Amino acid sequence: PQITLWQRPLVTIKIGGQLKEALLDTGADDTVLEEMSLPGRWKPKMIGGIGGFIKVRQYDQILIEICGHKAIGTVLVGPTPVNIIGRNLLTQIGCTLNF
Amino acid sequence: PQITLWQRPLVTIKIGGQLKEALLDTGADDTVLEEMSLPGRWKPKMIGGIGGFIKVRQYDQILIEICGHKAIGTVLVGPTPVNIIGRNLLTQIGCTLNF
Numbered sequence: 264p265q266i267t268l269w270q271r272p273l274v275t276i277k278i279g280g281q282l283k284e285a286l287l288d289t290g291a292d293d294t295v296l297e298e299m300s301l302p303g304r305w306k307p308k309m310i311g312g313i314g315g316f317i318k319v320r321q322y323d324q325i326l327i328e329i330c331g332h333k334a335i336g337t338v339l340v341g342p343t344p345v346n347i348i349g350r351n352l353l354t355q356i357g358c359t360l361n362f
Numbered sequence: 363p364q365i366t367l368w369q370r371p372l373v374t375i376k377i378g379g380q381l382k383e384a385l386l387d388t389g390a391d392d393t394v395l396e397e398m399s400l401p402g403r404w405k406p407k408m409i410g411g412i413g414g415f416i417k418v419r420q421y422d423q424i425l426i427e428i429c430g431h432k433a434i435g436t437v438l439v440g441p442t443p444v445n446i447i448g449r450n451l452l453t454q455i456g457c458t459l460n461f
């Protein structure tokens with residue numbers, strides 16, 4: 264669809280059976296979700312924001328539906344205040360910025 | 363224009379006669395620029411992201427040009443790793459998320 268930016272671009276996502284709310288974020292290279300269970304093994308990764316870095320677990324090839332649109336790719340899990348859909352998955356669902 | 367997301371959405375902005383590179387950031391409430399000088403009064407503000415909060419300087423009613431689009435709004439200045447155009451200004455230039 265078309266999402267204007269007067270409010271936070273919060274959308275519904277489906278991941279490992281559960282429905283959650285996520286922020287669509289063009290300012291993020293990666294996708295980062297709050298603490299949860301995912302299948303397979305994970306690698307270590309550190310990701311940086313405005314106030315410093317956090318330690319997250321990296322899962323690969325994770326199935327995730329974003330607002331009707333399927334995506335399969337990298338999901339990081341850790342102590343983020345918000346669920347963040349970053350560019351790795353925004354490109355898969357054909358997301359672009361327009362004006 | 364239509365900005366894709368394979369790479370970071372970095373555009374040229376004009377603020378205080380200075381040309382600067384900034385990140386178009388839908389996941390940001392506020393607009394935050396690295397250390398620079400601006401005219402007028404200011405208030406301190408605390409803003410949070412991944413890893414926590416930083417203290418910044420809040421300037422009101424600042425004019426910014428983003429890809430030749432004029433816009434007026436609040437500009438925060440402080441020790442951010444990157445120049446960031448948040449939703450408060452992206453709405454002014456008519457910027458939408460599409461897929």
Ligand SMILES: COC(=O)N[C@H](C(=O)N[C@@H](Cc1ccc(-c2ccccn2)cc1)C[C@H](O)[C@H](Cc1ccccc1)NC(=O)[C@@H](NC(=O)OC)C(C)(C)C)C(C)(C)C
Pocket residue numbers: 288289290291292293294295310311312313344345347349387388389390391392393394409410411412443444446448
């Ligand atoms: C309401 O709070 C805000 O709007 N905070 C904004 C903010 O931090 N937004 C983040 C989203 C966010 C929103 C709210 C909170 C929050 C905090 C406390 C309480 C509630 N919510 C936290 C994060 C996502 C933002 O796009 C950020 C921009 C950035 C990019 C690169 C370096 C520093 C900052 N992206 C990241 O942090 C990403 N970093 C990255 O890609 O590095 C290359 C990730 C996400 C991958 C680490 C801001 C500060 C830019 C205005």
